[PDB]
């Protein structure tokens, strides 16, 4: 999308996997505010927004908290309490038409600066000293939007870059989206430390002979001793018995 009419999207209720981003591109800009990129794949958030648009080369520096510029002033502003990451990569391969791509436009004139995460689409004619002309030239009476003019020969300072901004949320989260929790192959008949979906204990695992009802996941004998557990992957029932011990 063009920057003055950027496109928000929500991502929730998934197992987010951030190991796909690195394989995309050399990532001319990849910086994160409030989080580290390597420790990103293990925390859970409520709702994750993704804001994607296209800007010029020497303006990628404006997508940052508290920076006053021209696109961070009139058509995309993000808070000073930001928490998330930004990712921008050069895409002169796909957006630059010969002769000029007058399809990516940006707001050049506005009455007042805009609030964080605010979008405006109206293309009303801008105000002048006196009552504007009418979507036409005059003393001022200018028109707000302006094109870009991408061409394949421009420097890497006026070449088009695609940029996507991820915004997270963390407070009082009945968490909806975290990372993948990798598993390991099962071992049977050996004293082993196990972690079945959160239930931690030790013992030797043996094939069970008791009929768990389909909505049950744990088994207990008298006095709360976890006696059995069903595998969360293949659903076979497994018996737990503590490995041998005694006095000498």
């Amino acid at each position: 999308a063009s920057v003055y009419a950027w496109n928000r999207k929500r991502i929730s209720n998934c197992v987010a996997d951030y190991s796909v981003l690195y394989n995309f591109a050399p990532f001319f800009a990849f910086k994160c505010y409030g989080v580290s990129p390597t420790k990103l794949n293990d925390l859970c958030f409520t709702n994750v927004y993704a804001d994607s648009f296209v800007i010029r080369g020497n303006e990628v520096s404006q997508i940052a908290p508290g920076q006053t510029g021209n696109i961070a002033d009139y058509n995309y502003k993000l808070p000073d309490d930001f928490t998330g990451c930004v990712i921008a990569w050069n895409s002169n391969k796909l957006d630059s038409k010969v002769g000029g791509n007058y399809n990516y436009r940006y707001r050049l004139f506005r009455k007042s600066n805009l609030k964080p995460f605010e979008r405006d689409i109206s293309t009303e004619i801008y105000q002048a000293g006196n009552k504007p002309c009418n979507g036409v030239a005059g003393v001022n009476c200018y028109f707000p939007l302006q094109s870009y003019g991408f061409r394949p020969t421009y420097g890497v300072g006026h070449q088009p870059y695609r940029v996507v901004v991820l915004s997270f949320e963390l407070l009082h989260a009945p968490a909806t989206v975290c990372g993948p929790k990798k598993s390991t192959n099962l071992v049977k008949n050996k004293c082993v430390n196990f972690n079945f979906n959160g239930l931690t204990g030790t013992g030797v695992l043996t094939e069970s002979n008791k009929k768990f009802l389909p909505f049950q996941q744990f088994g207990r004998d008298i006095a709360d001793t976890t006696d059995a557990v069903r595998d969360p992957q293949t659903l076979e029932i497994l018996d737990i018995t503590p490995c041998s011990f005694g006095g000498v």
């Epitope: 391969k93 796909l94 957006d95 010969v98 002769g99 399809n103 394949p152 020969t153």
Partner: antibody, heavy 122, light 110 residues
Framework: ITLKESGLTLVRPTQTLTLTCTFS??????????VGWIRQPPGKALEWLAL???????RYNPSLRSRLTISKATSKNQVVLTMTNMDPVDTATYYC???????????????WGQGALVTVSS | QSVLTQSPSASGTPGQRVTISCSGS????????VYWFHQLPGTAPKLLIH???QRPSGVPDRFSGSNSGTSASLAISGLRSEDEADYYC???????????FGGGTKLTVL
């Protein structure tokens, strides 16, 4: 990636030319992708007619503007070109060509059709 | 100003290096990319070099391009007998707002 032209190859003067490039291996919905037309008289140099990007930017040859209309039919994965008021000087071969992305700059005319010899006579 | 000019003949000899010139103007060749095509008798052309210095995958190394001001050159090394065909320039002229082409060069090996 393949392209193929089709239409009527022979028409009298003061008539209209229609041509249809049906392609395979790319879609005019991705970014980058575009399709164009280029004519060449017999034994002369090439000439650019029109171009249509993926976002529907119908560029035309100015000197041949006011005569050309290019349109796409993406549902059938085909493009239609139309040029009115044919003349015997418009006898040429018409290729439909493809412009996709490269590695640091867009590629243009990397793949060509096979031409469609068009004769304007009686 | 609005037309690129090429010499009609190159006339090298096997295993030699030859050059093909392309003269443009301030408005098209000096401010845009220069392509170089190669059309053999009875067949659609085939790209050789885009962006003045890059070769599409599948063209031998012996083809080289050069842009200098408002002029253009293609350098063919190791001249062989399978290269006698038409070579065309192409560049976008902002003043004309259209693609423009050259005359063409013969390049017949002996």
């Amino acid at each position: 990636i393949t392209l193929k032209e089709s239409g009527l190859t022979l028409v009298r003067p003061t008539q209209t030319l229609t041509l249809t490039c049906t392609f395979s291996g790319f879609s005019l919905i991705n970014s980058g992708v575009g399709v164009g037309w280029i004519r060449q008289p017999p034994g002369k140099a090439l000439e650019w007619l029109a171009l249509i990007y993926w976002d529907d930017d119908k560029r035309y040859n100015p000197s041949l503007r006011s005569r050309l209309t290019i349109s796409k039919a993406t549902s059938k994965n085909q493009v239609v070109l139309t040029m009115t008021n044919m003349d015997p000087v418009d006898t040429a071969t018409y290729y439909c060509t493809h412009r996709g992305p490269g590695h640091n700059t867009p590629i243009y005319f990397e793949f060509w059709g096979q031409g469609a010899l068009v004769t304007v006579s009686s | 100003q609005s037309v690129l000019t090429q010499s009609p003949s190159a006339s090298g000899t096997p295993g030699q290096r030859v050059t093909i010139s392309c003269s443009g103007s301030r408005s098209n060749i000096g401010s845009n990319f220069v392509y170089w095509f190669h059309q053999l008798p009875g067949t659609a052309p085939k790209l050789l070099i885009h962006s003045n210095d890059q070769r599409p995958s599948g063209v031998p190394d012996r083809f080289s391009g050069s842009n200098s001001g408002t002029s253009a050159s293609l350098a063919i090394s190791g001249l062989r007998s399978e290269d006698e065909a038409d070579y065309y320039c192409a560049a976008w002229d902002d003043s004309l707002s259209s693609w423009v082409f050259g005359g063409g060069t013969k390049l017949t090996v002996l």
